[PDB]
Amino acid sequence: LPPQLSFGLYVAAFALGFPLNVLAIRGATATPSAVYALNLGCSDLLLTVSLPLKAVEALASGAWPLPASLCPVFAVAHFAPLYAGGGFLAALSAARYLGAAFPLGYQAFRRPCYSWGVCAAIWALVLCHLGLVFGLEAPVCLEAWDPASAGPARFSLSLLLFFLPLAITAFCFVGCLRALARGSNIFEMLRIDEGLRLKIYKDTEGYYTIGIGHLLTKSPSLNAAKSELDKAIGRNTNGVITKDEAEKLFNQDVDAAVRGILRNAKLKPVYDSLDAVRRAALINMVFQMGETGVAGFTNSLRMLQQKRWDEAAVNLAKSRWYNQTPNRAKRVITTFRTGTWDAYGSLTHRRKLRAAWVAGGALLTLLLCVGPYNASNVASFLYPNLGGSWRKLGLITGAWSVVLNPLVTGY
Ligand SMILES: COc1ccc(C(=O)N(CC(C)(C)C)c2cccc(C)n2)c(N2CCC(c3cc4ccc([C@@H](CC(=O)O)C5CC5)cc4o3)CC2)c1
């Protein structure tokens, strides 16, 4: 409440803000998360540099110690990096959400230049919106109430530059929570193991293959492969397909791998007794080897039916399958043993957990720092009875985003 306490809290924010954000930048410079943390660290620095001036203003109970014409420029130089901070948190939470909810789809669509593009658009939108609004409608500075005529303009700032990022961050945090519960499925697992190629290639066994691990023929003839490919799609392809056609063959093959297990007497008892994750591991095998091949793993299959996970793991490792494709086999074996997705880097529960925490941290620091000011500034044009201490507090909490913001990124 007293101006001396206001002064101190700003100084604390500066004093904590400066090192923490330089440290943040180095941590980011040592993926989309890094880009957003880097731009957040920079906007935090610009905000930090304006704090000494913000602090002396609070100490003088609102008195602006500089020429009145510099007040609009300082308003931009202070609020610009402030609002940008919010948007980066919103962008970062979006990247985390997309990574958590749609790992593979995200990774396919994602390009490094988009992250910068998004960041640029944020800087652009913020400075254009603030520069115009504060430039057209501006000895007291930031502590002063805005005239009721400046309402529509200042409201558009809060609406667009805070409330919208907030709502989006809230969506991303809820989506992240949902992603945790959703875990992962067999389609994602096989997409990682088989990869994606649009040209005809040879697998580790030397057979002609296309798409997401679709076996074309066991024949050594490339022309027989090109013939079987045109059968599978019903169109002359000449050894090249689209992503859409690949995904269609993928669902048919997963279906075929499942139906193969369903009609197998030696595979079906195990399939029936497993959970979905351990089921996914079985399907992966039958996808790679076929039903008869996997049916011959008599020992391992029996141990899996009796929930003897460790024994089964050790057994499966003695196979030709393990020696020919070790990385893939180890993942499928780990899946079998644990019944989790721990073996799959971009599908793991922890990765989804970190996204939830980043988004949650982001949502909270948006609510607590940039939140209170905008909530009270819009509530100043309505309700002419509003107390002055609400906006003054909001400016303090907003300043503290230079402390909170670097913490949520984890660098
Ligand atoms: C700081 O003030 C603001 C104000 C308004 C918004 C704001 O709401 N808008 C306005 C609009 C929706 C009506 C256009 C806004 C503005 C700039 C850029 C964007 C994308 N949106 C805003 N936002 C919120 C959504 C954010 C976002 C969504 C999003 C989705 C994918 C991604 C990428 C993740 C990555 O980098 O990998 C993925 C690759 C594509 C990055 C992404 O970043 C960007 C910042 C920030």
Residue numbers in the entry: 3 to 32, 39 to 146, 168 to 211, 901 to 902, 1002 to 1161, 1903 to 1904, 2214 to 2278
Paper text:
The structure shows that compound 1 is highly lipid-exposed and does not participate in any packing interaction in the crystal. This extra-helical allosteric binding site (A2) is a lipid-facing elongated hydrophobic pocket defined by transmembrane helices 3–5 (H3, H4, H5) and ICL2. The A2 site is located in the non-polar region of the receptor, so it was unexpected to find compound 1, a ligand with a carboxylic acid moiety, binding at this location given the penalty of desolvation upon binding. However, the acidic moiety of compound 1 is fully satisfied by four hydrogen bond interactions: three from the side chains of Tyr 442.42, Tyr 114ICL2, Ser 1234.42 and one from water on the cytoplasmic side of the receptor (superscripts indicate Ballesteros–Weinstein numbers). Single-mutant study of Y44F, Y114F, and S123A in GPR40 shows that a simple change of removing the polar hydroxyl group in each of the three residues resulted in significant mitigation of the downstream Gαs stimulation by compound 1 as a result of reduced compound 1 binding at the A2 site. Binding of compound 1 stabilizes the intracellular loop 2 (ICL2) of GPR40 in a helical conformation. The stabilization of ICL2 into a short helix by compound 1 (and presumably other A2 binders) could explain the enhanced G-protein coupling to the Gαs/cAMP pathway by these compounds.
